[PDB]
Design a protein around this ligand. Structure first.
Ligand code: I5M
Ligand code: MG
Lengths: 79, 478
């Protein structure tokens, strides 16, 4: 369910609802879908929806580059 | 023909008097002043042996100790350097190289080849910025300009050899002139922040603490990121005594969130200017006054400069403390570029050779000094990066489906939205937003890739697009 929540969140929050061509491999920052300066808005959504602690002291920001990477990170945190 | 550049004389004296003092930190590496100056002399010898004098040397290098040595090596051999943002697409670096026509490109291979073996030039560097035609636009930076700025900035910040300066920006941008050259002038250390670290709030916070950074200079957008990260606090940042922001406004709501993250005694300054002037207007924040301010002033022109505001009638009013007027800021004095290296910009052509620059910024004079109001042309700041809408338009017009294309912009607090308005060729498949972003990804850096698309039957044009009409066609179509 997390992968789908994240795709819908980016479609709704950043692309005015259009899922056209957006998938789990889309590079969100490289294509300027998410402003580099808005990363902590994604982190907040991910922490809230995933119910795992996400400490940015210890978690590489590359983990937020794609939906796939955000999902992979939560799998690693859920041990 | 010119005095020895004051920055080179200072750098040589520090290698002589304090050879073992740290000059530069980068990743796990550091150089003292002896190592930096010795390396710069080795590279200068190679440029001399190649018979390069009075020439452009383009530094196609990542942020590194060797890239700083190459800057000094160009000056020591009578040459000027062309820096580039190593993070941008290769096709844009190729367009800069074509525009700059350098005598020599220093790249990783050139350094590898090297390691396996009377100042006449008034120009120190040429910074190639976004050009309204698509052609990159070279801003000549003189030794006189750098000396003027650095001597002002050292005095303003009371910089000394005990300081540790961050270097956030790419060498392509003029913030790096303070971070590198003010440091070298006083015999301080500079932390070269690598491309992989520039957006990485944990790596920045860890480095501020590890290196005991005392002076930080950046755009507001990375300071506001560090605030939002929750990682910046006055204990981790206890060494910070001066924070300087420049390149775009810092909205007062956001700036009030940053101040509790910094040591109470830390001086916070707003520095203003385009590449053509470096910093030419400055304000030191009074934390007591800040609660009552709706905008942080850019402040007053540097000592030794003069300013005029050009009103809506085209009449130039001399800046005085008493002036209460909005107009285009025109700056005069030794900060002003002798001119563009490779293009003619008629608005500046009878200003630059008279040491005057028309900033394109609408500003207001107030009891607290100048206040930035907005731009009056098609150049926009995107998180403090300089973007000509005409550069993005020039690339979009090459898409096979596109007839005409124009951008417009929506501005918010530490946010900008670029909107592509396009018409199609007869019979063309309409491109989607993500398809056009993928088209631009090979060609322009991420901050120039627009995030909205509007397809229209026809773009409004005159007897050139009528930009006044774009917001309205976007409104109607939305
Ligand atoms: P994401 O966006 O991938 O990552 C976020 C991040 C890391 C913050 C990224 O966006 C980033 O690194 N951005 C910074 C880019 C940068 O370092 N820019 C530095 C150059 S800014 C300026 C020269 S200019 O010619 O480019 N701009 C002139 C222009 O800018 C406006 N302006 C300048 N100063 C001010 C102030 N104080 N207040 C409001 N506006 C200001 C004006 O419109 C002006 O004409 C530098 C700045 C000092 C000297 N020149
Ligand atoms: Mg610049």
């Amino acid at each position: 369910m997390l992968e789908s929540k994240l795709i819908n969140h980016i479609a709704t929050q950043f692309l005015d609802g259009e899922k056209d061509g957006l998938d789990s491999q889309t590079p969100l920052f490289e294509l300027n879908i998410v402003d580099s300066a808005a990363i902590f808005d994604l982190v907040d959504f991910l922490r809230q929806e995933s119910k795992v602690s996400i400490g940015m002291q210890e978690i590489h920001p590359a983990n937020f580059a794609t939906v796939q990477s955000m999902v992979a990170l939560v799998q690693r945190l859920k041990a | 023909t010119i005095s020895t550049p004051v920055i080179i004389d200072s750098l040589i004296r520090h290698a002589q008097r304090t050879p073992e003092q740290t000059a530069l930190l980068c990743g796990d590496q550091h150089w003292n002043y002896r190592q930096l100056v010795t390396r710069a002399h080795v590279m200068a010898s190679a440029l001399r042996q190649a018979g390069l004098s009075g020439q452009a040397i383009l530094l196609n290098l990542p942020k590194s100790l060797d890239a700083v040595a190459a800057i000094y090596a160009t000056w020591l051999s009578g040459n000027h350097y062309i820096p580039i943002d190593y993070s941008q697409p290769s096709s844009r670096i190729e367009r800069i190289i074509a525009a700059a026509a350098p005598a020599l490109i220093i790249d990783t291979a050139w350094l590898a080849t090297l390691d396996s073996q009377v100042y006449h030039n008034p120009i120190a560097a040429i910074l190639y910025t976004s050009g309204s035609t698509g052609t990159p636009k070279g801003v000549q930076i003189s030794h006189e300009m750098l000396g003027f700025f650095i001597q002002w900035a050292v005095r303003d910040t009371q910089l000394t050899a005990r300081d540790v300066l961050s270097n956030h920006a790419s060498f392509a941008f003029d913030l790096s002139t303070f971070d590198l050259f003010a440091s070298a002038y006083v015999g301080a250390a500079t932390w070269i922040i690598r491309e992989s670290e520039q957006k990485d709030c944990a790596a920045l916070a860890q480095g501020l603490q590890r290196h005991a950074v005392s002076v930080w200079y950046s755009v507001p957008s990375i300071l506001a990121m560090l605030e939002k990260s929750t990682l910046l606090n006055p204990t981790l940042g206890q060494s910070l005594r001066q924070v300087i922001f420049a390149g775009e406004p810092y909205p007062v709501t956001a700036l009030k969130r940053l101040l509790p993250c910094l040591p109470q005694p830390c001086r916070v300054s707003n520095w203003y200017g385009p590449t053509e002037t470096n910093v030419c207007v400055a304000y030191a924040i009074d934390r007591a006054r800040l609660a009552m301010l709706k905008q942080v002033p850019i402040g007053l022109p540097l000592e030794g400069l003069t300013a005029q505001l050009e009103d809506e009638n085209g009449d130039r009013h001399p800046l005085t403390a008493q002036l209460r007027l909005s107009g285009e800021l025109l700056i005069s004095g030794p900060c002003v570029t002798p001119g563009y290296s490779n293009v003619v910009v008629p608005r500046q052509a009878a200003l630059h050779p008279h040491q005057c620059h028309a900033t394109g910024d609408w500003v207001e004079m107030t009891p607290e000094g100048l206040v930035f109001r907005g731009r009056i042309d098609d150049m926009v700041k995107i998180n403090g990066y300089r973007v000509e809408l005409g550069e993005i338009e020039s690339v979009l017009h090459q898409h096979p489906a596109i007839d005409r294309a124009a951008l417009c912009v929506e501005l918010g607090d530490l946010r900008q939205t670029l909107i592509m308005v396009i018409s199609l060729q007869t019979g063309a498949v309409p491109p989607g937003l993500l398809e056009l972003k993928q088209f631009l990804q090979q060609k322009l850096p991420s901050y120039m890739i627009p995030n909205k698309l509007v397809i229209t039957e026809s773009l409004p044009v005159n007897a050139k697009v009528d930009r006044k009409q774009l917001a309205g066609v976007v409104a109607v179509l939305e």
